[PDB]
Amino acid sequence: ALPTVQSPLLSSLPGVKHAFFTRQGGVSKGIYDSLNVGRGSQDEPADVEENRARIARWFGGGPEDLNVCYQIHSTIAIVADGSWGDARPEGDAVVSKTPGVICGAMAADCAPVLLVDPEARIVAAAHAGWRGALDGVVQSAVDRMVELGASPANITGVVGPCIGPKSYEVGLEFLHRFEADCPGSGRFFKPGASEDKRFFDLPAFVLDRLATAGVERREWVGRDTRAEEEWFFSNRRAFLNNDGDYGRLLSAITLE
């Protein structure tokens, strides 16, 4: 029933269920309209819990089976072998080899990444904003999966809805940070509204991180959170509209 964005690269995997959720299908009101999963947001806590329950039910489980971190834009990848209840451990990636565990990541412009090694039977959900992506959250998630038994060369990784290259405007300090800290990343920047601006291609950069991490099977679903208000929440759109907060989209994967 819940609308979802799914990838052909993951939908064919038996015993594995994944989904990049939209803003539709929930109970939240106003700027949070329907499916807001942000426990750290200013929305009604009860509604947020109901939205999380709906998503958990889509997966065939319950709220306990949902594992989502207190995201801090780090490269910290946490392993989940069971329910955390209402606990939100600090981190930006959830990894598991345990059936029933739903690994989830939240976003509203940043890039969610779902990964899986279909042979070792290991899954993971990562939160890759510009900071996490630059610092290595993708490689970290892959490394954590490997600790559980995964093999880089057998991992499939998909980037979900996020702010697109036609929507992500950034300044020169941002540009220079990437050019200096990540050699060659300048190719992911495009001409902006002025010489003082540039458009950053986040999904392309994240795909590059996956490739550098040994992930050979990858893709971006090609959905722009900022551009498609009909389907996605967007921090950038919230900024431009002067909203003091925004709804959060969930992206998750699980070993059935």
**One-character DSSP codes across the chain:** ---EE--HHHHT-TTEEEEEE-S-SS-B-GGG-B----TTSSS-HHHHHHHHHHHHHHTTS-GGGEEE-B--S---EEE-SS--TT---B-SEEEE-STT-EEEEEESSSEEEEEEETTTTEEEEEEE-HHHHHHTHHHHHHHHHHHTT--GGG-EEEE-SB--TTT-EEEHHHHHHHHHHSTTGGGGEEE-SSTTEEEE-HHHHHHHHHHHTT--EEEE---BTTT-TTT---HHHHHHTT-S----EEEEEEE-
Other beta carbons less than 10 A from residue 232's beta carbon: 26
254 closest CA partner among 75, 8, 81, 69: 81
Bridge partner list, 217: 156
| Residue 142 to residue 136: CA distance in whole angstroms | 10
Cβ atoms of 230 and 238 closer than 8 Å = no
- Could you tell me the two tokens for 192? 């902006």
| Residue 17 to residue 252: CA distance in whole angstroms | 8
Q: Looking at the domain covering 1-256, what would its CATH class be? A: alpha beta
- Could you tell me the two tokens for 29? 């009101």
Kindly give, in sequence order, each residue whose CB lies less than 8 Å from that of residue 160, ignoring residues fewer than 6 positions away: 5, 7, 20, 107, 111, 112, 113, 114, 220, 221, 223, 251
Sheet containing strand 77-79, edge to edge, reads: 77-79, 93-96, 122-128, 111-117, 156-159, 217-220
Delimit the domains of the chain by residue range.
1-256
- Could you tell me the two tokens for 178? 């990437």
Sheet containing strand 66-68, edge to edge, reads: 4-5, 16-21, 249-255, 102-107, 66-68
Cα angle: 7, vertex 234, 19; to 5 degrees: 20
**Phi first, then psi: what are they for 134, rounded to 5°?**
-65, -40
Residue 191 carries which side chain, given as an amino acid letter?
A: P
Kindly give, in sequence order, each residue whose CB lies less than 8 Å from that of residue 239, ignoring residues fewer than 6 positions away: none
Spell 94-128 as b/e; 16+ CB within 10 A means b.
bbbbbebbbbbbbbbbbbbbbbbbbebbbbbbbbb
Beta-sheet pairing, 102-107 with 66-68: parallel
Spell 21-32 as b/e; 16+ CB within 10 A means b.
bbbebbbbeebb
User: What does R_g of the chain's alpha carbons equal in angstroms?
Assistant: 17
| Residue 119 to residue 150: CA distance in whole angstroms | 8
Largest CA distance in the chain: 51
Cβ atoms of 172 and 193 closer than 8 Å = no
Cβ atoms of 168 and 175 closer than 8 Å = no
